[PDB]
Every structure is written in C-alpha cells, then in structure tokens.
Amino acid sequence: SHRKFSAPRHGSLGFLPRKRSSRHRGKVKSFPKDDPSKPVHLTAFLGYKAGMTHIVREVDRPGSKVNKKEVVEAVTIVETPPMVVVGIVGYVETPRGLRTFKTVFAEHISDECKRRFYKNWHKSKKKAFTKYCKKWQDEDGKKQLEKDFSSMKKYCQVIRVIAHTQMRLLPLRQKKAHLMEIQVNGGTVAEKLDWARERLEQQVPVNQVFGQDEMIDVIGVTKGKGYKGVTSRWHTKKLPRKTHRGLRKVACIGAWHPARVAFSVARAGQKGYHHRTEINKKIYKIGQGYLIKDGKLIKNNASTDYDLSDKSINPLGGFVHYGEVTNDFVMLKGCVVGTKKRVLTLRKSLLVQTKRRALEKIDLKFIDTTSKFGHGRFQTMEEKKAFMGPLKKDRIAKEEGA
Amino acid sequence: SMLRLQKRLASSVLRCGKKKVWLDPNETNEIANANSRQQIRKLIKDGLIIRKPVTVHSRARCR
Amino acid sequence: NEVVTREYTINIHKRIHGVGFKKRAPRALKEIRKFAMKEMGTPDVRIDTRLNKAVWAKGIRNVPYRIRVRLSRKRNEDEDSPNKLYTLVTYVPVTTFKNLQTVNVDE
Amino acid sequence: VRYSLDPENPTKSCKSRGSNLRVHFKNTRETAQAIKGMHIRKATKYLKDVTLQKQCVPFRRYNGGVGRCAQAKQWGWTQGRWPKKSAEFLLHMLKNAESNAELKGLDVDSLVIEHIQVNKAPKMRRRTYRAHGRINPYMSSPCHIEMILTEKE
RNA sequence: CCGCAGGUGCAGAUCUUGGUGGUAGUAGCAAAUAUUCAAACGAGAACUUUGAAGGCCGAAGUGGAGAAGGGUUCCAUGUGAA
RNA sequence: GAGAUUCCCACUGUCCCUACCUACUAUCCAGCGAAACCACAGCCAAGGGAACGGGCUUGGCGGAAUCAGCGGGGAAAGAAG
Ligand SMILES: [Mg+2]
Ligand SMILES: [Mg+2]
Ligand SMILES: [Mg+2]
Ligand SMILES: [Mg+2]
Ligand SMILES: [Mg+2]
Ligand SMILES: [Mg+2]
Ligand SMILES: [Mg+2]
Ligand SMILES: [Mg+2]
Ligand SMILES: [Mg+2]
Ligand SMILES: [Mg+2]
Ligand SMILES: [Mg+2]
Ligand SMILES: [Mg+2]
Ligand SMILES: [Mg+2]
Ligand SMILES: [Mg+2]
Ligand SMILES: [Mg+2]
Ligand SMILES: [Mg+2]
C-alpha cells in the first residue's frame, strides 16, 4: 500500500556512484564551447585552497534591502602561482568522439614537472624525456616536429596545452607538480597552435586567464569523511530511542517485491572525497603576490582603496594548516570544495552571464586578517603591539640589546 | 630462580605480610638455597632478607 | 664514533597526544624506546628504572610533557648476541626545558 | 618411510619429515605453497621475514575472511598474512633438512625446495561450553609435513 | 555345477551406529579502572621469580579463620606428553 | 499503593534536527578456534505452471579471487501448527 504521508526523497540520484574519486586533481570534463570570433585564450587554471576569510563591501544592487549598504561576505583564498606550459595536444573529431591525434612536448621540461612521471623519484635515474628532448636540436627531429605541427594544423579540431603548477613556490610538503590539459579557445587551429607554440616553456599567470569580478566554475574533490552510515551519508531520519538493533539505520530497505534491494535505497559506505563541480563562483579579487623591487611588497594583497594598511592576505599567525601565501591568489566568493592545500581547477563559465548577480562590480572596503588559529582580534602585528604595549619578553630582550 | 617458598617462609618468620618481605635481588642464588626456617632466620640475621617499613599514613593533616 | 653519548629532550606531550588515559604512560615508554632506536640506530634499547619512574611519576595518564634523557651507545660485546651495540637511556633531572639543545656529552 | 613424489635422483636430494605437528593446517599449507620452489637461502630469509612481518604469505585457497595487505601485491594476490608458528615450524624442518644434506655430503648452497607437502593429522579433541548447557568441539588441526630438497644451480 | 535352507539384494524411513565436509581460519577468546622498567633462571618470557614504580580491594575486603560439602586438592622435589 | 486513568507547574535531545566526545567492541594482526544450517545451487522481466520460479519457455544478458557492511529475497533457520 501507499506510504501514508508524502515526503521528498533523501539525497540526489544524480551522484549515485558515491565512491572515492578515482582522481585527486579534479578534471574539467567540459570545456567552454569554442568560437573562432573571440581572441585566443586559455579556458582553465590550477590553484590551491589556502583558506577562508571574510570581507566588507558595499552592495550596488538596486531595489534590495542591502542597496548602498555594507555587507560582510565569506571568501576563499586560492593560491595560484603561474602555470608553466610544457606541451601541446591536438584532438581530432571522429564518429567515436574526440581522439588524441598528436602530442608535442617542449624542450627543457622542469624538474618538478618531471617528478609527476615517477612513482619513486628518489630511486629514479631521472631519464624521462631525455631522449625526446634531443630531437629539438638535430635537423631530423626538428623536421619531424615541424611535420607534427603541420599535421595538427591541418587535421586537428581542438588543441590543448599541457601546463604544470610550480611546487617550489608553495609552502607545501609536496614537490611533485600537477599537470593539466587546458583547452585553448577563440580562433582558428593555426592561430591557436601559433599562440601555444609561442607560449611553450613559458609562464602563464592567473590574471591572463581570469579577470576581476567574473563568475567561474570550481572543480575539485571534496573532503574525505571515511566510511559513514545512512544518517550521516544520506541524512535520513534517526529512528526512535526504543529501537532494538540500532537507530542510525534505514528501517525498510525495500518492499517484498521486486525481491531485491534497489539502487535508490540509502545505504552506508564512503562519504566525502567525491569529485564535484560548483558553478557561478565570483572572483572578488586577484591578488598580485610578493615583489622585491627595493623592499618586499605585501600591501598589494590585502590593502584596499579604503584601508591603505600595509598588510598581506595572510592572517595573523599564518593560514591554519596551509602555510604562508606569497604568490598570486584568487579571492572567490563563498565556500569551495576540498580540504586546505587541496588542488582545485578553475574553469571559465560554460554559461552566458547576463543576470544582475553576475556582471556586478565588486569593490572591497576591508579584508579581515585576524588570526584564524583561535578567536583572533588584531588585524596586524603593529596594531597588536600598539594596543598591548611592551611586554615582559620585549623588556628582557631590550635589556640584553641595551 | 623462583622464591615463592622463601617469601612465604620469610613472611612467617618475620611475622609480617608478604608485602613487607624484601629479598635481595642480587643474592638470588643464596636466597634460593634457603629451604628451611632456620636458614631464613640466618638470612634475616645476615641482612639478605629485610622487613620493609610500614607505608606512611600520617595524621598531621587530621590534627 | 660508536660509543657516543648525547643528551636529548623528548616531547612526550607531542608523541602521546590523543592516547587514552590507561595507555599514556605505557605509550610514553614505547615512544621513548622508539625515539632511542631512531636516534642511535640500535634495536637493543634499555631504559633505566629511574627513567621509568620519572615517566610514571605522575600516574598513568598525567605523563610529563617534556623529559630530558641521555642516550649512551655502548658495546654489547659480552656474549654471542645478534647486536653488538645497545642504547642505555637514563634520566636527566632538569629545572627548566627552555633553551636546551641536543648536546654531545663526554665520558 | 614412503614419501609422495620420490626424487628423480636420490643422491642429489635430501628429505625432511614431521608428524602431528601442532600448527594450523591451513596456514601451514599456504606457507608451504609460498616457499615451494625457492632456493634454501631464499626460503630461510623469507620465513624469517614472515616472522618479522616484512614479507607475507598469500592466502589463496584458505582465504575466507583473511584481510588484505600491501605485501600481497608481491604475489599476484590481495590477501596475505604472517603465520608465525607455521614459519617457525618450517624453519625447524629446513634446518633438519640442511643437516641431512650435510650428513649426505652435498653442499647446501644449491638446494632448492622441489617437493613440499602438508597433510592433515588426526584431530585432537577439546571441549567448549555454550549457552544452554551445551557442549561443542574445540578441535585442533595438526599437520604432517614433508619436504624434498634437491641440488641444482 | 545338481539339489536343499534362509536373519538373502537399499538412496531415502526429521531411519540406527560410526566417520567426514562446506560453513571457516569464520563467529568469537569485550561484565567488575592497569599496567611499566630492569635483572635472574631458561633453548624459548606480555604472562614465572626477584627488585623498583603506578594502581585496585578499602575492615559489610579481592584480608584473617570456621560449619556443610570435597577427599589428598595440603607440603617438598622433578617433568613439560596431554 | 513499583496498581489503572486525566490535567497543571517545573524539567529536560522525546521531538524540531541532529551534532560532537569518552570507554568497550566491531575492524587489522600473532596465537587459539566452534556452531546453526546444507537436494543441487544461487543475476532478472514476462509467460505458463500446484493459480507468487534460482532452474522450464521467450527475452534481458553473463568475466577470476575477495574485504567491510547490510537486512530486499532464499515464500531463510528454529518446532511433525
Ligand atoms: Mg500520494
Ligand atoms: Mg526493545
Ligand atoms: Mg579558527
Ligand atoms: Mg566470510
Ligand atoms: Mg561459552
Ligand atoms: Mg550449565
Ligand atoms: Mg533382513
Ligand atoms: Mg545407505
Ligand atoms: Mg575474528
Ligand atoms: Mg573479542
Ligand atoms: Mg581505593
Ligand atoms: Mg573471608
Ligand atoms: Mg600446592
Ligand atoms: Mg522472476
Ligand atoms: Mg501436524
Ligand atoms: Mg503437534
């Protein structure tokens, strides 16, 4: 008989293989549709989730309760050191799909990039691409490479560049760089091949790929939660306290017929570490990173047009469980999948942004830099010292320093 | 080697519990050779077997 | 050399963090033994009874956060044994742990 | 005594046997299958590593409920364990076989385990007590073991 | 082979007795806070013994002695099959 | 009055709406090691059939060996209703 009262289903069947992701990076799975009218550009980038903070900004939304008002909004910092382009892949369209036609790798592949090709770098002889790079010098290999480029020009429909991240600029333990095929859009195949070939061995910063106050997609693997039950995994109703064999269960896992457990019944297993794609994350800021012209510059990270405070994006005492952010970063709006120092893919939006939520100018007034390792209450070291005055350890240091 | 008999006999001779019987951990063979209460008495006289003092339960706090 | 003796300080707090109450002191002994094995490369590690008493001084669950120990690598050449070297770990009483380095100590 | 699989030449070969050994037949069978065909030095160090939990024996036939380990990937398998008692019993049998090889006067740096066989022994009865005044068996599963080593290099 | 005579032919009877599998190296070895260090004996020590330490019973006891019941379990030495 | 019932104050995780922590397990390992049950076995839809099939017909299809869970089925087991 029918269930006595109607209730919506727990969880979505659109994510049913609720399993550990087979990948750690997070693959794009759909690049933006290519039109030759646009200029040649890259469609994606790789960053690392540094941490979260919040900002103060004035809203320019007419007809809203918060029009011309100040709001506090949570933001995520994604450290994005420049990618390095080391290869070009061509794809050809077939009645069976896109297939890889030819891959051409640049000379002088970086050490951290070459680490990706080895499971045990310590015991390796570091021989990868050593014979391949020799064909960039002799005339035979150069002719073969030119033939490969011409074949890509005359046969391939879409081309992509292999780009890797720069581990040495990150505060992480890992030295193995992350490789990625990033699609080149906006032009003829010849034009995008010329563009990619000029960008071989070069560094592409994040400001050449993404711009201010545009809405992008974030692709990544969520935080792992291990083996979880139905109550935590599918958020089913807890059974009453009087239940005998357990109350964190689904009471009925199916009727007598069809005499099997259906795939749509909530059951325990892996939770978290799932590949996910969240669209429409606005870029509130693109930080500039640390420079040394005559002295070290850190203002360009957290100083706004109304703050004018010489402070960087790093919170007081550093980002918890990440480290210190010294490269370019992207201040996105809201939360982003994954743990700290988890690698994320930033992709251009597949959609046309016409709503007034999008295309809205973002002007920050304040960026919070209090310590996240507790209830931080001071924005800067100088402010904390000015408030608290000299201390005992400062006194005993100055006594020795005379 | 195994001094259960010696500990029991020492407790009986010293008129204390087996808690308070102290056998010399270095003179294990000499104590193990003791199989009689006379030999236990001789070991007590020689100092290889000692009656440990009562654990202190002070009444200064109560006073 | 191989008959070297050094003075270390061990973060028992760090190595015991997360261990249940009835396991903290036994795990502190196990971590001290593992620390000695890692530092001196000797599977044969003896722990002085004074050091054991120092670790068990405050009961089974309130183990001291830091402890100053002395690792001495000594010849085991007294009988036919698989290992010819062993590490004796003794207890070094200190009043403070501030600014204490790992120091080579002479004979 | 009658061994199964008599050696092809009983002058380059030595034999070892044990009966009613108090080890589990299933674990011992898996360990014997693991060390079968090995050189004697390799088998000795492998059994020592099994005792030290640095190399596993793959549980292939008697694998019901046996957990997974990383060391099972050395073999083409997933389930492996470290039967200490089986390893020690096979080590004693290997020492006995090496002594027999010494007595027969053939050098023990070229011996290979060509034959090894584990058979069930007569079970020994013990008793366990269950919920409602019931008695259940608590049988042991001892095993006979035999091995034939042969010189080859 | 010719006759004679049967306690004369098994797949079953939740058959009788005996033996053996899969289950399965699985369930399990989770009631009463707790063990650690060194040494000795020893082929072999998480469990034995000694010493040190940390704990528990807390005198209505996990202490000291009896009745009923048991019947040698008491004590010393030795062994390491079960 | 450890009797049956209704309401009120207080109280609260009974609930909204669940979350987190602790001990012992479960889990993995060394050692030890049962039992229940068992025609053969074990993926489905429909058909017909002792009128609700694991086997038959017609179709869908089918890839070694396994681990932790689970309670839809085996018209599961337990007892000649
Ligand atoms: Mg309805
Ligand atoms: Mg109930
Ligand atoms: Mg915080
Ligand atoms: Mg099983
Ligand atoms: Mg029982
Ligand atoms: Mg009974
Ligand atoms: Mg008859
Ligand atoms: Mg029959
Ligand atoms: Mg088990
Ligand atoms: Mg258990
Ligand atoms: Mg007490
Ligand atoms: Mg009494
Ligand atoms: Mg007795
Ligand atoms: Mg059917
Ligand atoms: Mg009937
Ligand atoms: Mg009846």
From Swiss-Prot, chain A:
GO terms for molecular function: RNA binding; structural constituent of ribosome. There is a cross-link at K38, K223, K225, K285, K365, K385, K392, K398 (Glycyl lysine isopeptide (Lys-Gly) (interchain with G-Cter in SUMO2)). Residues 1-36 are annotated as: Disordered. GO terms for cellular component: cytoplasm; cytosol; cytosolic large ribosomal subunit; cytosolic ribosome; extracellular exosome; focal adhesion; nucleolus; nucleus. Coiled coil: none annotated. Keywords: Acetylation, Cytoplasm, Isopeptide bond, Methylation, Nucleus, Phosphoprotein, Ribonucleoprotein, Ribosomal protein, Ubl conjugation. The modification Tele-methylhistidine is found at H244. Constitutively monomethylated at His-244 by METTL18. Methylation at His-244 regulates translation elongation by slowing ribosome traversal on tyrosine codons: slower elongation provides enough time for proper folding of synthesized proteins and prevents cellular aggregation of tyrosine-rich proteins. It is not required for incorporation of RPL3 into ribosomes. The keyword Phosphoprotein applies. There is a cross-link at K293 (Glycyl lysine isopeptide (Lys-Gly) (interchain with G-Cter in SUMO1)). One of its GO terms (biological process) is cytoplasmic translation. The modification Phosphoserine is found at S12, S303. Its main location: nucleus. The modification N6-acetyllysine is found at K135, K285, K293, K365, K372. Residues 17-30 have a biased composition (Basic residues). Component of the large ribosomal subunit. The ribosome is a large ribonucleoprotein complex responsible for the synthesis of proteins in the cell. Belongs to the universal ribosomal protein uL3 family. This is Large ribosomal subunit protein uL3. It comes from Homo sapiens. The lineage of its organism: Eukaryota, Metazoa, Chordata, Craniata, Vertebrata.
From Swiss-Prot, chain B:
It is found in: Cytoplasm. Citrullinated by PADI4. The modification Phosphoserine is found at S12. The modification Citrulline is found at R4, R15, R37. It comes from the Eukaryota. Component of the large ribosomal subunit. The ribosome is a large ribonucleoprotein complex responsible for the synthesis of proteins in the cell. Component of the large ribosomal subunit. Belongs to the eukaryotic ribosomal protein eL19 family. This is Large ribosomal subunit protein eL19. It comes from Homo sapiens. The lineage of its organism: Eukaryota, Metazoa, Chordata, Craniata, Vertebrata. The chain holds residues 2 to 64 of 196 of the full protein.
From Swiss-Prot, chain C:
The modification N6-acetyllysine is found at K58. It comes from Homo sapiens (Human). It holds the Pfam family Ribosomal_L31e. Component of the large ribosomal subunit. The gene is RPL31. InterPro entries: Ribosomal_eL31 (IPR000054), Ribosomal_eL31_CS (IPR020052), Ribosomal_eL31_dom_sf (IPR023621). GO terms for biological process: cytoplasmic translation; translation. Keywords: Acetylation, Cytoplasm, Phosphoprotein, Ribonucleoprotein, Ribosomal protein. SMART domains: Ribosomal_L31e. Component of the large ribosomal subunit. The ribosome is a large ribonucleoprotein complex responsible for the synthesis of proteins in the cell. The modification N6-succinyllysine is found at K38, K53, K58. It is found in: Cytoplasm. The keyword Metal-binding does not apply. Its main location: cytoplasm. This is Large ribosomal subunit protein eL31. PROSITE patterns: RIBOSOMAL_L31E. It comes from the Eukaryota. GO terms for cellular component: cytoplasm; cytosol; cytosolic large ribosomal subunit; cytosolic ribosome; extracellular exosome; focal adhesion; membrane; nucleoplasm. The modification Phosphoserine is found at S81. One of its GO terms (molecular function) is RNA binding. Belongs to the eukaryotic ribosomal protein eL31 family.
UniProtKB/Swiss-Prot annotation, chain D:
GO terms for molecular function: RNA binding; structural constituent of ribosome. One of its GO terms (cellular component) is cytoplasm. GO terms for biological process: cytoplasmic translation; translation. It is found in: Cytoplasm. Keywords: Cytoplasm, Ribonucleoprotein, Ribosomal protein. It comes from the Eukaryota. Its main location: cytoplasm. Expressed in pancreas, lung, colon, cystic duct, gall bladder, kidney and liver. Expressed at high levels in the well differentiated pancreatic tumor cell lines HPAF, COLO 357 and Capan-1, the moderately differentiated pancreatic tumor cell lines T3M-4, AsPc-1 and BxPc-3, the poorly differentiated pancreatic tumor cell line MIA PaCa-2, and the pancreatic tumor cell lines of undefined differentiation status such as SW979. Expressed at lower levels in the poorly differentiated pancreatic tumor cell lines HCG-25 and PANC-1. Belongs to the universal ribosomal protein uL22 family. Component of the large ribosomal subunit. Component of the large ribosomal subunit. The ribosome is a large ribonucleoprotein complex responsible for the synthesis of proteins in the cell. This is Large ribosomal subunit protein uL22. It comes from Homo sapiens (Human). The chain holds residues 2 to 154 of 184 of the full protein.
